[PDB]
Amino acid sequence: ANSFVRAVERACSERGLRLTPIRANVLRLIADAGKPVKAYELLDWVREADAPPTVYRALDFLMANGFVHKLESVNAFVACHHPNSAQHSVPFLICDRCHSAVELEDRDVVSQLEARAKALGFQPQAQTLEVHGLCAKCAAA
């Protein structure tokens, strides 16, 4: 949480990149929210000021390096729970009702879909895998 930035902070020294204060505050804000964050919410909270395109390029950096995931079906961002997995494709369980998002890791599923793609000549690079339905709390309500 507060430590998580520090963990990401040395995942960047350890390769070409560096975590500017702006990237750290964006990362910290997303990690602290505990539901997926809309881009306009992140700007609001980073104004608690930086020009907006500065925060948007900090967000791009976080995404290209796999520290933040964009959830395509809700158009919202979440911090990667394990950050030095480089960039990676993983399933998310996204509750329809409370909007929580849980990040899994399945290499069998991603490998199967790669094989499916390559057997039709498609050269596959990043997969969007989002499972919808209800989390345990909401299903029990």
Place this chain on the structure above:
Amino acid sequence: ANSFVRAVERACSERGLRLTPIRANVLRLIADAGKPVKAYELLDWVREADAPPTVYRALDFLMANGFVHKLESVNAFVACHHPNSAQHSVPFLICDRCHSAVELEDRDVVSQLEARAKALGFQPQAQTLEVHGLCAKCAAA
């Protein structure tokens, strides 16, 4: 193509529903495009006139009954290649460069992700599975 509507036309009698001319023209337009269609493009072409919320409810009907899929990562619609599969979760290969979308069917992949979900208490209902990269034509260019 022209026949495809007729095929969907009797997939609807065969259960509670009916394919109004408006739903048929929306379905026909999407099926004829051969790339994913944006909602505002569909309205343009259905104006070739109907009030827009009429076409948007025809689109909703098509989606709820599994005749049209919304691709979440490109915010665009495609006709289902095999329509009486009820509503279903299936992978799509979506080319990053030419934007073609190919609809597959994998019951192993969808079943695995259901099991993953249920083992954490999540009750899973519709999955978004979209594989990105380059189709064979674009990879060869």
